[PDB]
Task: inverse folding
């Protein structure tokens, strides 16, 4: 019980208090799934396309790894939902870094082949040779990202194109 | 499986389907909760349960079962009537006898009445009646009344008001 009361407006819009939207990191545009509970409740929960995608991500990340041999992360808007190459305990279900959020917002794919000391997981700085990120934008809306990285090899067009292909394929799925 | 986006201003639209199956009208106040799983919960704010969610159905059952007249009151009026006529009792002010019986907190059985006021100021012919005060959290919040203008009440009906008062009480806790 937050015991916050709001009225529903003409148009059936209720405002979710900013407190809530922060403790749940719901940003403008975020999709929420609605349920009615037995008790008659209305239920709102973040809707993560990319995450209930469940195993596209896993299978995709696995293939990228078999093919390129680099570490591969796929995230929704909040956590990493698939990990290959690197260790799952390190990344799976962990909060993405701020760099990831902005890259996703920036909507454009990136390739850093130099400049080490990056954060993939919120608050953890990591040794890194190079990485590339392909934001997964479905319906103009960033809903996740694909990350390929290497702690001792340089990324090039090969891996850069690969995240673009992955992001594009995955995006299409969510449409 | 209906998805809606939250807008600038943190407003999500509750689909019209929902707003109908829950009869939420423009302006209605909704209480917000956050849950374990990080779900937001909205519920029509009053909140929670109140005597009368049940009274009708309960009084009806008591009548189908025992065939006597059944009244249920809150602290002021009769909120459910079965057996007898609704026009006679529904929304009418309880008698002083009812108020004191409720205060007295204890259930009563008058199997040898000749009269009784159920409604404030109206004396009524009565064979017998039994009253079960509805005490929730040690506090009388209503009563269940079974009465008969020509039959005697016994353990059957006496137990019945006790069961009804106890069940209804629990609801309000």
Result:
């Amino acid at each position: 019980a937050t015991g916050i009361v709001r009225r529903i407006d003409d148009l059936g819009r209720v405002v979710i208090p900013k407190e809530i939207r922060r403790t749940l990191r719901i940003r403008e545009g975020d999709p929420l799934e609605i349920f009615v509970d037995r008790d008659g409740d209305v239920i709102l929960k973040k809707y993560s396309p990319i995450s209930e995608l469940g195993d596209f991500a896993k299978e995709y990340a696995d293939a990228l790894y078999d093919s390129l041999g680099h570490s591969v992360l796929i995230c929704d808007r909040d956590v990493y939902i698939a990990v290959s190459g690197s260790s799952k305990k390190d990344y799976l279900n962990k909060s993405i870094s701020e760099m990831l959020e902005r890259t996703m917002d920036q909507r454009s794919s990136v390739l850093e082949s130099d400049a080490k000391s990056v954060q993939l997981v919120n608050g953890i700085d990591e040794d890194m040779n190079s990485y590339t990120v392909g934001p997964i934008v479905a319906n103009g809306d960033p809903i996740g990202a694909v990350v390929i990285f290497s702690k001792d090899q340089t990324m090039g067009e090969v891996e850069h194109k690969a995240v673009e292909t992955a992001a594009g394929f995955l995006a299409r799925q969510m449409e």
Notes: The first strand of chain B starts at residue 2 and ends at 5.
